Amino acid sequence: IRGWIFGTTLDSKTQSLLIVNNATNVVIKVCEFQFCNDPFLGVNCTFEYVSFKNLREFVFKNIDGYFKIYSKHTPINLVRDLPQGFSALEPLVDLPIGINITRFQTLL
Amino acid sequence: GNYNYLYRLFRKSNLKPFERDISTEIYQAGSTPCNGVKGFNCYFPLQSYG
Numbered sequence A: 001i002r003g004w005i006f007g008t009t010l011d012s013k014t015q016s017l018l019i020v021n022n023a024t025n026v027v028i029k030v031c032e033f034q035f036c037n038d039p040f041l042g043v044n045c046t047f048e049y050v051s052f053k054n055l056r057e058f059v060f061k062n063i064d065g066y067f068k069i070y071s072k073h074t075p076i077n078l079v080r081d082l083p084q085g086f087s088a089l090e091p092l093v094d095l096p097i098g099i100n101i102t103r104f105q106t107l108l
Numbered sequence B: 001g002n003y004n005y006l007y008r009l010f011r012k013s014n015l016k017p018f019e020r021d022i023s024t025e026i027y028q029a030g031s032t033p034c035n036g037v038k039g040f041n042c043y044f045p046l047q048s049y050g
């Protein structure tokens, strides 16, 4: 799992978000995209930004033109499914991008 | 006249706070099957001050 896409049509007709993680960096961009649907192949210009044991958790929300991301990482012993207990997600990033999102998709 | 400045005259819904939307898709007010051109009560969404 290496990223996400967000928007309405996702492709061509409107702006859409792209989030990609490549272990060297996180790359974030917003365009009228027609981009690749599978970043495993590695093994318009409205905004741009750069920076089973592991449970990685995230929250994404869009409010007043800002796209908030929160996260947490924890190791888990029972890898079967979401383990019973409590742990709170700290903030990551808060993108000033202004886009109408109704749909999203994950990148493998 | 300077036509390099435009404003959107029509949209299907109002913008939320700091919402941004540059897509020039045709706005339809009539029953017209416009399919991406101007026509009877069917409109290119941007206009200019000139």
Ligand SMILES: *[C@@H]1O[C@H](CO)[C@@H](O)[C@H](O)[C@H]1NC(C)=O
Binding pocket: A008, A009, A100, A101, A102, B013, B014, B016
């Ligand atoms: C966002 O876009 C969809 C069409 O793709 C539309 O139905 C929705 O009303 C838009 N949001 C607002 C607040 O108008």
